[PDB]
Amino acid sequence: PGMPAPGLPAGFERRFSRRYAQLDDVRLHYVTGGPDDGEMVVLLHGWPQTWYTWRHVMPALAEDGYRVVAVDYRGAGESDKPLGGYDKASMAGDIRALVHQLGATRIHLVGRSIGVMVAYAYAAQWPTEIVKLAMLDVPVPGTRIWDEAKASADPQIWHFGLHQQRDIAEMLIAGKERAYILDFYKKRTHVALSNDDIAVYADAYAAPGALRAGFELYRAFPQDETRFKAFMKHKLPMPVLALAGDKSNGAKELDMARELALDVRGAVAPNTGHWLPDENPAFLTRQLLDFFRE
Amino acid sequence: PGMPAPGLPAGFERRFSRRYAQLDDVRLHYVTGGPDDGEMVVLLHGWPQTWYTWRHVMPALAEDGYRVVAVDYRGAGESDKPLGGYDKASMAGDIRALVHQLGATRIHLVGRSIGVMVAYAYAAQWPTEIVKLAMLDVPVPGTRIWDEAKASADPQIWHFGLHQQRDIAEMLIAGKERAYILDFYKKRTHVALSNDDIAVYADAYAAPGALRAGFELYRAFPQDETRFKAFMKHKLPMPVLALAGDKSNGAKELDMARELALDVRGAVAPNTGHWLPDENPAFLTRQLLDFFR
Amino acid sequence: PGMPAPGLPAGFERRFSRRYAQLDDVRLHYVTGGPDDGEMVVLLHGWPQTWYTWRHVMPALAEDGYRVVAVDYRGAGESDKPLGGYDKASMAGDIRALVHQLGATRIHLVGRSIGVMVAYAYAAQWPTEIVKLAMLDVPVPGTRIWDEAKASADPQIWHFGLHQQRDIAEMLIAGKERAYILDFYKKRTHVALSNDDIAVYADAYAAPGALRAGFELYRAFPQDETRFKAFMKHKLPMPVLALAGDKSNGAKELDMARELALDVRGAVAPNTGHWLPDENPAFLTRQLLDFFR
Amino acid sequence: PGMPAPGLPAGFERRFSRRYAQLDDVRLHYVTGGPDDGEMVVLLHGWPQTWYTWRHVMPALAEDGYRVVAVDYRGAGESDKPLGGYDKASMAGDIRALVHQLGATRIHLVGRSIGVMVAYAYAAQWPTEIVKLAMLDVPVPGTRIWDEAKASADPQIWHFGLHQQRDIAEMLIAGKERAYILDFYKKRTHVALSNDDIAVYADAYAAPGALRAGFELYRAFPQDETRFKAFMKHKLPMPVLALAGDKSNGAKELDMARELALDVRGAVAPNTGHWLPDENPAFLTRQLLDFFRE
Amino acid sequence: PGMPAPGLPAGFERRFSRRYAQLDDVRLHYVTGGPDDGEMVVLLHGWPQTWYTWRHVMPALAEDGYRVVAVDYRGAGESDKPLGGYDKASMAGDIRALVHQLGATRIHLVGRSIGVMVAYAYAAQWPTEIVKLAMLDVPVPGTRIWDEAKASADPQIWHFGLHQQRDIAEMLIAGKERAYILDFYKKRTHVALSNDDIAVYADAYAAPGALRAGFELYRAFPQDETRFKAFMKHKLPMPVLALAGDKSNGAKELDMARELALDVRGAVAPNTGHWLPDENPAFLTRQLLDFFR
Amino acid sequence: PGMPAPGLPAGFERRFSRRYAQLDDVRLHYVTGGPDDGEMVVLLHGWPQTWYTWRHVMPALAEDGYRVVAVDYRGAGESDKPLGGYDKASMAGDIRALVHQLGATRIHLVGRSIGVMVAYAYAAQWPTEIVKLAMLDVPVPGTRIWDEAKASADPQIWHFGLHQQRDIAEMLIAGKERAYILDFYKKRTHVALSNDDIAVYADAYAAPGALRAGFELYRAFPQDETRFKAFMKHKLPMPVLALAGDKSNGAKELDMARELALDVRGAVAPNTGHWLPDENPAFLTRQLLDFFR
């Protein structure tokens, strides 16, 4: 019992930091904490999110010794918004480059929504470099669950069409990001969240270029589908964990992951909606720790 | 006494929780706190309000062991905004289905403004399920006080006309929810309230569809008048308490309740306007807790 | 057969002129034509209108030798927008001062909507100076037809409440005058009108102060009610004509007028809604010419 | 050759009239011309259109002795915008009540977009009352052409999702009706049209309630699918003509119609996009007169 | 003598047609007239322009038997606005694909501003296919005239910096296209132009995506610089004409062209600023007809 | 290390004060703290900043007994926005007149961006009055580094062109100061800063006339180039310290200072971008305090 408590968890400010990494043309923003020599855990948000969605998971990961890296991927948050490169395979290259610049070679990888597609493209292109992979909330293109949501005309993906209308989507939503994003979020949540927390996301997507860059993730879905379907001719060898809330995709995250990897295990969060990190960070943190422990 | 203190009362975060209930068509948002096994007290806000109007009534209420369920009814606050179902009788059915969901099956009902019409419609359709009922601040359709406000062209119900203009009302007020709602509120209050508290209501009604959903409550008034007139031909058997501020509807809130229910008692709040839960919670809780003994 | 033809009728531009009259504080705008020596016919528009509503009536009146004066009353159109003076009795004084300044003293008087209240106040205060009075479309305050629309909560006066909200009405409608007024007009019309014609009205009410000044006509209704009830203790002695469309107030214009005058005759416009000069000017000009002859 | 010529054709003003029909609670606006005693031809526009889309077709129909009735259906143009009644079967009832008020019982019926769904529901519910039916540009719900566009996630129906979002669609598009509708239109045309003509439609949809009422046609699609599938158990007996542009649906209007009626004939307009009355009224006028003489 | 006459020249409407060409991903809009069998002349506008800038040149070309094709290149006017492909070499590929789709393969080519960069990239990549090339008003990247404007910080390219700011440029200029573009045009003109003509351009750049697509032409300049410097290791073999107004770049169009081609001839337009087709179409058509003959 | 901490440092309220100084034309706003009798340290911000950029440098500075005077120069922050005087030399004269007002007559000067041009112009015109001088972050006009940024078309000075467009820059950015300034800032930083701190700058430049006044600083650049070139023919006699972040101008801030002054020393701040007082105050104060021994 208790009303929603907005903001970063107590003491977060003291341990975690905001940092920037210059890559070949693109600058990525990320939040990193924990011991510098520890096993690196890279966390990838989705749409419409930033690194901030991991605010309640990052402390616990770091309190078990890991080197936490929460990335604003290309086009999101405080990261640069280049013209293109929003297909998920190339965005995985951005994350790999960041990781290499931070001195690492093998990483644990957690992604949700758009971020779990980037994470999969990371594991598919450089499988030796991903020790363990955690897949949250959303199916990846190329899977059967994905093709079904599309062929059924699933009401939950009504926005795929709109987001893929270049310039039109931006013209409609500019100036109404808070109203559009708060409604998008609340229709898919089950645990009550604080408006001040969701407004952190909405305000990021109101910054110049943030709407456009976010929508280009959706505009690359056809290219991602063709690319990911080729990726799925070699199932992943590393251990994979699949999680989703019972009031949204649930079990279908584990069904989806088993089309992509040989070593799969999964759980469904009780009384939890689409935003696992926002709604049920305790369940998520534990599952990641039990999963990341040998 | 001193200046208005905005926000939830101290310690409120710790004791209450926000929850959702999925019904067939609609998902309803509600706030609860206190022991689970206790007698349930259902609170129904009005226009232009949310559950937040009971912020000073719910703590004390469930410090005495009551199960407090403060509901955003269909279309308000964080609840869904469906196409229809905005007649007050069907809205009562939504509240019953949520009550049934929570495991209860008989409760104590308190309502003001639109909520008191829902609260009455609840008691009228399922008399057995309402232990008691507290009518606050506003008369219900079908009563004489309601019909006399209409015949008087009472200055206070000036907004009935505008709110009943579909699309026109939304077009005029969209983007001006704060200015419209703060003025609507301050013109009907007597105790000075904080802008920050009124802005909580205004911001909810600025949300997508919230203007339309609230205005459809007014667009259903003719249907409610016919329906409530049928309900009042069977006077309520339960004890009923009527309260209103002396600067607004005063004692005709009591007179209105006598038209509907047999076992009625009432009081008039001193130096308080239209918004009893906001203006004088102290008088109100104290009145509620005694009534609830 | 035919699509609506917007604008002034052919030849209007060469026969009529826009003019201003400076009174002691207020400058009034008016359009005039016909012989300088002819019997003067004063035409008073209402809300949301200007002199332009008489555009299809004025040529025929001028061809029959009448001196046509279509006035933008205080606060409307191109006239000044003073702070006050929007009670109808004082606005009749404005029209009388302009009439005296043009060298006339006895006049034929035609009014609709707000203008028929001004026109009645003119006739009640100076009955010897009004030769004949024609009353269109809307009842005047103080009559039982007026009180009956109010007590019934007639849907067609929903806007009384909103317009009487000082500052709120202006804030809601500023910048949306075209949408608000076009909708107001079409919901009450029966003959299809051209949007370009109604926008001439809407554009006038978008000019600085025009919204405020027009709503002050509505904010003065209680004072008009008290003032007109005293006027109605003495029925009007001059001949009176009552007209309205069969699809709007119809015969109630004649019922309303018989409480106001001893010598009343009336007719109902066929296939006509609320805007007699806009919808059926052919019927209106014929009835006026026969009445004034 | 020639540049686009905007507006009504010469002489239109003296030959047609704007009229209203009061139904039991809703008022409908329509434009009518031609002989009072002639065979009635009812024309039903779609989204985002009004009667004005038939401006180049109504003169030729009326000069051949037909009584033309181009209707703004419920919620569109100058018609009333009630709360409900936006399922296509009920909207056909509105059209029938207005035809009956004009003294007619037998009509030729032409529809496109949403109007062809109303026109089909008219013929399905009162088949004896429809002499001939012409179906333009768009498939109706329940057909497999309709169901295959849905299962493909066909890019040309991207807007079905957005339009079905109550309040979100109105909030995003209010104040941008011109930019939204001009783009919607030009992306589906092949013949160059004048901006002034499309703006006539866009300005109608900027009117109070016109966006909401238009989107409720789309929010009623599930109910239309159930209702229309039942309608197609009994194929239509009257002669049916199917037309579409080769650069849009083309021959699939012809396939779609053959699932609905026994006596079907069709043609495909050359070098024509989605908006047959706007783009190639010469072809359409020729096709309708030949069909109505037959 | 004469005030500026806005719009298309008389008879243009009956002689030319707007058409679309679907390429493999992009649909291009273009205006064409003259004999279907004539030698094809392709005209490429720049920023902030559309095909409409050739309105006073196309009739004379068509009367002399040329097949006129005035193209809205990728991202401009009524053409599609794809995500990328705004480097000038790829945009030349778009124009070539449209030319091949119209049944032609050898063409006369005219370009100004961005279009002269596209036109040069066309000639550099497919020199056998360009019969003659006419270069107007603006230097192309890679030349010393281009580098000299950059190193000098020429005030006339102040906008390069702003247009290369992705998302920032769009946010600043969205909704103010008319003020931004009219000012840009008049500061560089010498002959007075009609505001209605320039607004045809401004209104195009206000349509969805048009601002973004046009600025991507500027954001591709570094890539164009690298690509064109490689192209300039082989001077163009076909005849080249260089033109600019005496009040703008003047003889520097001929200096720039001589770094690009072996066979170059040039002239300077009298009493002409930056917009040769808008300001002095009479001089431009004469020079083009003599060059192509 | 951890997350950015927005606002003034703890205890700041207590130790510093806001004051105004009326000069002949203009009133200047400035912040001060520390002992009155101490050596005065003058701080000059740049674009787009106010005194607030020194919030982490001024405390420590005057904990060592310095007299800290952080000035909003002519046109910035809470200072007046006159018509002219935006060449950097005259702005130095304004700073001197304020220094004279405060009773001092020789001081220590620290400046960045526009302030370092003012600070240099101060030392150039009255060499005797400046004890020492710390140049931060930006090269001054007339130097080679300045001239090479112009010839390179350095991507960082993209805004010189736009800011030099009178009325155009104000029209584009008015109402978009926060989005424009936050982006301008974050693109040039390396240490992550809080939006709340950057918004303080943005809100000042949203004030009436603040956009115009700041942009006139850029519109005077050609005049400053001529004036500073004259000043640099007499190399400065005072000790000069040059600092810049390694991710921005780095060591050419030192190279730039050697062009102007004889006794120069410098350092380059590690892992810091363009905004030394904002990004690494710690390195900066420590560097300043040592230099100031």
Author numbering:
A (entry chain E), D (entry chain B): 11 to 304
B (entry chain G), C (entry chain A), E (entry chain A), F (entry chain G): 11 to 303
Lines from the paper:
Here we report the biochemical and structural characteristics of Cfl1 and Cfl2, two Cif-like epoxide hydrolases from Burkholderia cenocepacia. EHs that belong to the α/β hydrolase superfamily of enzymes utilize an Asp-His-Asp/Glu catalytic triad to open the epoxide ring substrate and release the vicinal diol product. Cfl1 and Cfl2 also appear to utilize a Cif-like His-Tyr epoxide ring-opening pair instead of the classical Tyr-Tyr pair. While Cif and aCif exist as constitutive dimers, our hydrodynamic and structural studies revealed that Cfl1 and Cfl2 exist as octamers and decamers, respectively, by forming rings of dimers.
